Amino acid sequence: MADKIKDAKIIFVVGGPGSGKGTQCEKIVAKYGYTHLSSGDLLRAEVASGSERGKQLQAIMQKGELVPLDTVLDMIKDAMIAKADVSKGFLIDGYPREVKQGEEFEKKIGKPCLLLYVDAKAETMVKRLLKRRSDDNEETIKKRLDLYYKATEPVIAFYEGRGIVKKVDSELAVDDVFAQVSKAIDAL
Ligand SMILES: Nc1ncnc2c1ncn2[C@@H]1O[C@H](COP(=O)(O)OP(=O)(O)OP(=O)(O)OP(=O)(O)OP(=O)(O)OC[C@H]2O[C@@H](n3cnc4c(N)ncnc43)[C@H](O)[C@@H]2O)[C@@H](O)[C@H]1O
């Protein structure tokens, strides 16, 4: 499974809170059949388990802060292994969010062939979150934004240098955004 995974198409999806990551990923799953792994969903699944670990994660995520790298990466890796036998490709949604998170993923799992940069303005994100969990109040949204611009924007730079970033314009209507997404995936 390790080797299957290292040989799979691996797509990173990066974007600010409320930018449209999950929305576009669900469209990618429906059309292309990738195995969707949301870091948020995996973390919230742990919270919902009622485990002691979940309670810890709850406290972190409700404050809008980043969970320890090893915790989220281990979750994803295990999730990839469990799906490795049946998976046609992996869609990694909301990881990496730090340059170090990308590096450790490449060390422990494999190399991305594509990064979809789901690009939107902060203002757009804020109103999208507002119009739509426990991380939803004003203060938390701001911390989430802060962290994104501080920690996660360097990830885009990293993979632009790698040469695998395709920017999609998330200010467009969802289907027009997806048309950009499709163009990038069809090219793989
Ligand atoms: N790697 C990691 N390392 C450490 N900690 C981590 C971590 N990953 C997660 N965590 C922790 O978990 C927390 C949650 O993170 P996480 O769940 O991973 O990311 P998020 O950005 O907070 O997720 P969102 O669902 O809020 O945003 P989204 O981009 O998916 O937008 P969506 O498609 O739903 O859309 C939002 C709204 O906008 C609408 N919408 C989407 N696109 C459009 C469009 N084009 N036009 C109009 N409306 C649109 C949608 O219908 C919807 O209503 C993190 O803060 C962190 O604490």
- Among 140, 94, 134, 113, which Cα is nearest to 10's? 113
Secondary structure percentages of the chain, helix, strand, coil, to 5:
60, 15, 30
Q: Which atom of ligand 1 is nearest to the CA of 95?
A: 1
Question: Ligand 1 centroid to 147 CA: how many Å?
Answer: 13
20 lines ligand 1 (CB under 6 A): yes
Backbone phi, psi, residue 35, to 5°: -80, 115
How determined?
Answer: X-ray
Instruction: Find out whether 102 and 159 touch, Cβ atoms under 8 Å.
Output: yes
- Beta pairing partners, 119: 169
23 lines ligand 1 (CB under 6 A): yes
Instruction: Find out whether 160 and 116 touch, Cβ atoms under 8 Å.
Output: no
102 lines ligand 1 (CB under 6 A): no
Does residue 96 have a known ligand-binding role? yes
- Burial zone of 45 (CB within 10 Å; 0-12 exposed, 13-18 middle, 19+ buried): middle
Instruction: Find out whether 54 and 47 touch, Cβ atoms under 8 Å.
Output: yes
All structural domains of the chain: 1-188 (3.40.50.300)
In angstroms, this model's resolution equals 1.9
Q: Which residues contact 171 (CB under 8 A, 6 or more apart)?
A: 119, 120, 121, 124
Between helices 69-83 and 39-49, what is the axis angle to 10°? 100
Torsion of CA 66, 150, 41, 31, to 10 degrees: -160
Between helices 52-61 and 39-49, what is the axis angle to 10°? 130
